[PDB]
């Protein structure tokens, strides 16, 4: 009783019924497999980013003034265009009313 050994016959149909989805790339991907020395130092950097917090607020409030002051320191046819202006509901309102104000 021999039988069929191997095929990949209906498989490309079955893979495409629910689709061959690309894997879900979202930002901030995981850090598994990165170099442990680099990751240990990165965790030390993240552990001490709060240390220079005063320099951040000092330079942030200083950069706010030096740019917020710097912003205000120196500061197709005569038929079809005209009909598109008259038949515009908000632009051609008084000019549309002028037709009746002549038509009386």
């Amino acid at each position: 009783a021999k039988s069929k050994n191997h095929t990949t016959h209906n498989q490309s149909r079955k893979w495409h019924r629910n689709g061959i989805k690309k894997p879900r790339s979202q930002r901030y991907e995981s850090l598994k497999g990165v170099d442990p020395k680099f990751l240990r130092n990165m965790r030390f950097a993240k552990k001490h980013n709060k240390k220079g917090l005063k320099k951040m607020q000092a330079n942030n409030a200083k950069a706010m003034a030096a740019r917020a002051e710097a912003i205000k320191a120196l500061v197709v046819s005569r038929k079809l265009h005209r009909l598109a202006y008259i038949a515009h509901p908000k632009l051609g309102r008084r000019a549309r009313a002028r037709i009746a104000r002549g038509l009386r």
Binding site: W15, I20, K22, P23, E29, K32, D35
Partner: protein
Amino acid sequence: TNTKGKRRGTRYMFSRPFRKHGVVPLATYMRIYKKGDIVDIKGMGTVQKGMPHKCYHGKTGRVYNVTQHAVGIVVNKQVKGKILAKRINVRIEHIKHSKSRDSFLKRVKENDQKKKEAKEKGTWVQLKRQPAPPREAHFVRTNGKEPELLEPIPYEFMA
């Protein structure tokens, strides 16, 4: 059935090109691979260490980890009906920088360079690249000469 060997059927794939054997040229080793950089995988057979498997040869991926002599790359690999994002470790000899993204970088530099100027001049530039349009109506000058008359050749049995 076949064998599940790691280099099965890689006789021409991992072989060196003709008259390209021997010493690896040393600017292969001098290229800077950052995190997130897009590179192409191509297994050099001179170096037997760090060799990618044959299913990664000719695939393009994103570098997620850098070590002394090798990088980790996220590679799309289709496994029947699902595509997995591979975390592979492969040496510097078996990779090369992909040029597919550095023309998009050329396009974004000439697109922000065409947004930031001509805005003060008021005109409108184009940034989305249109496909190859139908050919414009043009005149064809036959100055003097009449178009040469072609006939099919008689069949002669060549050999």
